[PDB]
């Protein structure tokens, strides 16, 4: 087994774990669990109103 | 404004635990990363 | 023993791309879970506390876009453009030993789409109408002995004449294997003019009885309910369009005592709620002042969710008492899952 | 000016940022379906 | 399988070029969410 | 469209609903926009209606 | 199969079960599929059902 190697699973891992840690860093500096962003477009709408 | 505070604002005494999380799941996949890409090297450099 | 070298290798090398093929499976299986999963999500937080939430277009919107998904991931799984899990599929088997017809079966789903394979829905209105389960009546839930079929454990249960739902949903819940059954009714009510007097009728939930009296206008029995929440434990709403609604956690069937008042014409006509919705349009009333009303009595609905395969049956009017003409739980409908 | 525009205004803003939110709840869908279908494209590469 | 895998690389970069796309998306519809915003505040101050 | 709606059926293969109030082109596109999962169906409307 | 079961035995060398709960060809298929192992069978439902 030379020509790949089956350890890309790390690499999915890591990049769902890196979007992840984006959103809780957002989460964290903005102090809302309910980003601005598309997160819960209907908590997004209930925090509108 | 409580209703905002209670549907908006983190309750982060859990998120401060799940971004600790991930911080070590992050470095724990680099680490199994840096051991894994090691593994072809040894077994070509020894069984050639 | 070259023969056989020979074959055991190359049926050792088709196991690897049978593996290889279950592994991509498993993958689109595992992202089918995902989306049910947010879909749970969705469908929890779309509870809106039934009233708070008036983005509901968009959140059926959401809900849609996550079903569109769900059926490419159906699709684009295509290992070799001959994709697995929808559309058809041949029900292959990989052979992986040196002999003719030495193999091994797969049994992959037909799709992760629509009715063709979610879960299988046993209601009252789905055949054409529902008969007194589910609707309003004079005589009551009749005799019989409504047959059960799936897993091959059938069930002959016993309903006799005069079960309310909640009783026949205890009944036929336990034996049959996953299965459940809830009892539901729900039912409005609109007091029509009343010509010198009231309606001093009474209603009998279950085991105790109601006493209200002076009953004018829908606002006056809205009342009367409110008031008498503690002794009847049926939550009653009366919004600003007038249509008094009426709806039992448990599921009795609630009945309308005699129509003993003071009026001489007027009658509160009633609908119920069908199984999976479309609440009945045709108005039929429990009491009338003067001559005697028919459909005195108000019995909800029960709903039969069932995962694999569940079929129903009854001798004439013990099928159609349950859930109509049904005799199948096909109709599964996730697409037309609303929200 | 006077009169009307203290509640036409009112009477804009809301079904205005009702159809905004409309749009970021599309938005939104559109988006947690392209995660989902990266998730499951980089699982059915790699499996490939 | 090559042409497939590499099929699936083109299209998850296609798709992250999506994502980024439907994201400036949202930051301009939240901005002018906030606009709407301070709209009504306007006009509910234009009761005066 | 003139003097009442050009309430329709929508047939497609097995799944089968029926739209009401047409009125207009962006009546119809948003509709099917909403009954699109349902009967599986891709309603886009572009830019030119 | 109208009004009633299809309930039958099924004899497969020396082990023999006798099926119940039939009434339609998935229904045959997924009873003896579960009993494939006891009879030493192999019971599969194709695409056409």
């Known amino acids: 087994v030379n020509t790949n190697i089956a350890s890309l699973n790390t690499q999915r891992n890591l990049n769902a774990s890196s979007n992840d840690l984006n959103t809780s860093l957002q989460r964290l500096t903005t102090g809302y669990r309910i980003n601005s962003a598309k997160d819960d477009a209907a908590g997004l709408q209930i925090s509108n109103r | 404004t409580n209703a905002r505070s209670r549907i908006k604002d983190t309750d982060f005494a859990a998120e401060t635990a799940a971004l600790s999380k991930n911080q070590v799941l992050q470095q724990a996949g680099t680490a199994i990363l840096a051991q894994a890409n090691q593994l072809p090297q040894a077994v070509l450099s020894l069984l050639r | ?339 | 000016s006077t009169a009307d525009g203290a509640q036409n205004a009112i009477a804009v803003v809301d079904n205005a940022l009702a159809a905004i939110d409309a749009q970021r709840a599309d938005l939104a869908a559109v988006q947690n379906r392209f995660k989902n279908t990266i998730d499951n494209l980089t699982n059915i590469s790699e499996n490939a």
């Not at chain 3, 879909?39 to 506390?49: E, P, T, V």
């Not at chain 3, 054409?128 to 005589?139: D, E, I, P, Q, Y």
């Not at chain 3, 609630?254 to 069908?274: L, M, R, S």
């Open chain 3, 1 to 339: 023993l070259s023969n056989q070298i020979s074959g055991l290798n190359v049926a050792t090398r088709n196991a690897n791309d049978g593996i290889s093929l279950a592994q991509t499976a498993e993958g689109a299986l595992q992202q089918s879970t995902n989306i049910l999963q947010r879909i749970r999500d969705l469908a929890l937080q779309s509870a809106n506390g039934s009233n708070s939430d008036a983005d509901r277009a968009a959140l059926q919107k959401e809900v849609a876009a996550q079903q569109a998904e769900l059926t490419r991931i159906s699709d684009t799984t295509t290992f070799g453009g001959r994709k697995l899990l929808d559309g058809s599929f041949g029900t292959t088997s990989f052979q992986v030993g040196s002999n003719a017809y030495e193999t091994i079966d797969i049994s992959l789903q037909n799709a992760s789409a629509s009715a063709i394979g979610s879960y299988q829905v046993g209601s009252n209105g789905a055949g054409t109408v529902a008969s007194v389960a589910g609707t309003a009546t004079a005589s009551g839930i009749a005799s019989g002995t409504v047959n059960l079929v799936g897993g091959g454990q059938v069930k002959n249960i016993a309903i006799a004449a005069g079960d309310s739902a909640k009783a026949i949903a205890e009944k036929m819940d336990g034996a049959i294997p996953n299965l459940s059954a809830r009892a539901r009714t729900v039912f409005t009510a609109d007091v029509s003019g009343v010509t010198g007097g009231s309606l001093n009728f009474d209603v009998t939930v279950g085991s105790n009885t109601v006493s209200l009296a002076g009953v004018t206008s829908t606002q006056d029995l809205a009342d009367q309910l409110n008031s008498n929440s503690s002794k009847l434990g049926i939550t009653a709403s009366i919004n600003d369009k007038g249509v008094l609604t009426i709806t039992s956690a448990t599921g009795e069937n609630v009945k309308f005592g005699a129509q003993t008042g003071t009026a001489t014409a007027g009658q509160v006509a009633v609908k119920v709620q069908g199984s999976d919705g479309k609440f009945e349009a045709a108005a039929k009333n429990v009491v009338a002042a003067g001559t005697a009303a028919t459909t005195t009595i108000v019995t909800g609905y029960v709903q039969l969710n069932s995962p694999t395969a569940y079929s129903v049956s009854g001798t004439g009017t013990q099928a159609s008492q349950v859930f109509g003409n049904a005799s199948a739980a096909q109709k599964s409908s996730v697409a037309s899952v609303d929200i």
